[PDB]
């Protein structure tokens, strides 16, 4: 047939604030999202001649993806099931903690 533009733009309002437009399949999952978020900075760097220098291991193993009360933890669960659709606003969250890493001030 004809393959035009398929997928969705999932926004990742990083904890800090700066949101990152991630792309995924119309039927992506929490996992993919992560992979994408990574393939967004990774692929980018690669195309921009850059070597990875972000411990996604800890990051992923430290923060999660949130939207609106719905904790995006399950990877075997499609986002569409979480209520996340194309052109949505998702942000990161910090596991049950107390303090937080400041930036300004």
Swiss-Prot record:
Keywords: mRNA processing, mRNA splicing, Nucleus, Spliceosome. It is found in: Nucleus. Residues 8-99 form the Ubiquitin-like domain. One of its GO terms (cellular component) is U12-type spliceosomal complex. GO terms for biological process: mRNA splicing, via spliceosome. Its main location: nucleus. Component of the U11/U12 snRNPs that are part of the U12-type spliceosome. This is U11/U12 small nuclear ribonucleoprotein 25 kDa protein. It comes from Mus musculus. The chain holds residues 32 to 123 of 123 of the full protein.
């Amino acid at each position: 047939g004809s393959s035009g533009s398929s997928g969705m733009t999932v926004r990742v309002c990083k904890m800090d604030g700066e949101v990152m437009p991630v792309v995924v399949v119309q039927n992506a999952t929490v996992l993919d999202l992560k992979k994408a978020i990574q393939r967004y900075v990774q692929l980018k760097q690669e195309r921009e001649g850059g070597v990875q220098h972000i411990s996604w291991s800890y990051v992923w193993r430290t923060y999660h993806l949130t939207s609106a009360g719905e904790k995006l933890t399950e990877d075997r669960k499609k986002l569409r099931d979480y209520g996340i659709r194309n052109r949505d606003e998702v942000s990161f969250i910090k596991k049950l903690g107390q303090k937080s890493g400041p930036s300004s001030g």
